[PDB]
Amino acid sequence: IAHGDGRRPNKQRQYIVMKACNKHHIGAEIELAAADIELLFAEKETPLD
Amino acid sequence: EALLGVYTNVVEFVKFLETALAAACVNTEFKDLRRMIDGKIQFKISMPT
Structure with missing residues (x-):
């Protein structure tokens, strides 16, 4: 608050605070059959049934 | 002292579709046999009287 008329403040204070980031681990598992990966990627690029 | 000759086997094999077996x-080569688990072909066979 501004000065004057019987009002005496604890004039403007400034922190400088250093805080830390907190890491987190998230796991997941995808299983895929080897048949569908191979038939969807073939060296002969003719179309499929 | 001489080195009179240097020789080595070369292996050739008559593959399966060129033998008499x-x-x-009947030979129907499939793309990825890992896709199907069990073949369970059912037949309806009817006899005469």
Whole structure:
């Protein structure tokens, strides 16, 4: 608050605070059959049934 | 002292579709056999009287 008329403040204070980031681990598992990966990627690029 | 010759086997094999055993079997090569688990072909066979 501004000065004057019987009002005496604890004039403007400034922190400088250093805080830390907190890491987190998230796991997941995808299983895929080897048949569908191979038939969807073939060296002969003719179309499929 | 001499080195009179240097020789080595070369292996050739008549593959399965060029032997005479394929006269006793039908050969239908499939793309990825890992896709199907069990073949369970059912037949309806009817006899005469």
